[PDB]
Amino acid sequence: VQAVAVLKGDAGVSGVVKFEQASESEPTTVSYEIAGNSPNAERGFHIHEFGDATNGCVSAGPHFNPFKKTHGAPTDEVRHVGDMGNVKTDENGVAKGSFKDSLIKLIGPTSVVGRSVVIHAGQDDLGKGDTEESLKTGNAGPRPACGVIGLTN
Amino acid sequence: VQAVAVLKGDAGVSGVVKFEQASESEPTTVSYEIAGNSPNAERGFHIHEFGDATNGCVSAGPHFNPFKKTHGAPTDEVRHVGDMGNVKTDENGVAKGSFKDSLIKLIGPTSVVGRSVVIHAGQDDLGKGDTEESLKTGNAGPRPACGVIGLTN
Ligand SMILES: [Cu+2]
Ligand SMILES: [Cu+2]
Ligand SMILES: [Zn+2]
Ligand SMILES: [Zn+2]
């Protein structure tokens, strides 16, 4: 199964995020190409609960957290399903790469199809900051771009 | 369960389409508010197979037709699942209304979540025209606006 999200916003940030999972027990491969970010930085990358674009990126809601855990790093045992950490931007402000993830799924009760992908304006503290907010959002900041995850061929 | 699609394009057409279904056997209520259309006309309204927005409204693919039937009217026995017919625009070019549909579903194997909603620039001939194209698209024409159907609260 394949899915894709086109990140759009009004801050000059945009990109494409592709998802791919063969079966439900298999990990999902996430590939992304995002431009318009600050050069040479880390930017929070997450899947938010709602694929609602009526109110910009705001209506996407909180991080997809069906298991009611606190915010963390993709590699943490305790993290939100939608926690993809930080993406690295080069000197031209382009973030590009891919990775596999076992919590994010395109099949089953926790499918992210129809939900949102959000790129933040700030760095994700991975739930290590000493603030209550660290545990919810990772203090990643504003959401310059987002896209609803849709099915593709 | 509730879902929504925000129709965007570069032709001045835009709107919001909301979906609502309590259980899978129940009909889905579709509500829509679209502006920027030709005044006092009929415009093809359909759910296309892919929620792929990488290539404008083109990448949304054909009408959602899991049962491999020909194009028809919402009331026809033989129609594509995604066949919502024509929406009527007033003197200000606004199409607004709602209806229930038993083929369109937000739950189950034929869920339209993650797929696309497309408003056309032309009138849907409801598969009555005498052209082969009538049976595929209804000769509805160009796709000025579309949106990926996402989950909401
Ligand atoms: Cu986020
Ligand atoms: Cu159509
Ligand atoms: Zn999180
Ligand atoms: Zn059709």
From Swiss-Prot, chains A, B:
| Entry binding sites for Zn(2+) 1 | H63, H71, H80, D83
Which cysteine residues pair off into disulfide bonds? C57-C146
Localisation per UniProt entry: Cytoplasm; Mitochondrion intermembrane space
Give the top-level enzyme category: oxidoreductase
| Enzyme Commission no | 1.15.1.1
Which positions in this protein are listed as binding Cu cation?
H46, H48, H63, H120
Q: So where does substrate get bound? A: R143
Quote the SUPFAM superfamilies the UniProt record gives. Cu,Zn superoxide dismutase-like (SSF49329)
Fetch the PROSITE patterns from UniProt: SOD_CU_ZN_1, SOD_CU_ZN_2
Q: Describe the reaction catalysed, as an equation.
A: 2 superoxide + 2 H(+) = H2O2 + O2
Which is a Gene Ontology cellular component entry for this protein? nucleus
Lineage top rank: taxon:
Eukaryota
Name what cofactor the protein needs: Cu cation; Zn(2+)
Positions binding Zn(2+) 2 in this chain are: E42
| CDD domains, alphabetized | Cu-Zn_Superoxide_Dismutase
On cofactor binding, the record's note says:
Binds 1 copper ion per subunit. Binds 1 zinc ion per subunit.
Q: Pfam families under this entry? A: Sod_Cu (PF00080)
Q: Where is this cross-link: Glycyl lysine isopeptide (Lys-Gly) (interchain with G-Cter in SUMO)?
A: K18, K69
Family affiliation: Belongs to the Cu-Zn superoxide dismutase family.
- Tell me the subunit arrangement: Homodimer in holo form. In apo form, heterodimer with CCS1. Zinc-binding at 'His-16' of CCS1 and Glu-42 of apo-SOD1 is required for this heterodimerization.
Q: What does this protein do?
A: Destroys radicals which are normally produced within the cells and which are toxic to biological systems.
Q: What is this protein called?
A: Superoxide dismutase [Cu-Zn]
Q: Which organism is it from?
A: Saccharomyces cerevisiae (strain ATCC 204508 / S288c) (Baker's yeast)
Q: What high-level taxonomic lineage is stated for the organism?
A: Eukaryota, Fungi, Dikarya, Ascomycota, Saccharomycotina
Gene name linked to the record: SOD1
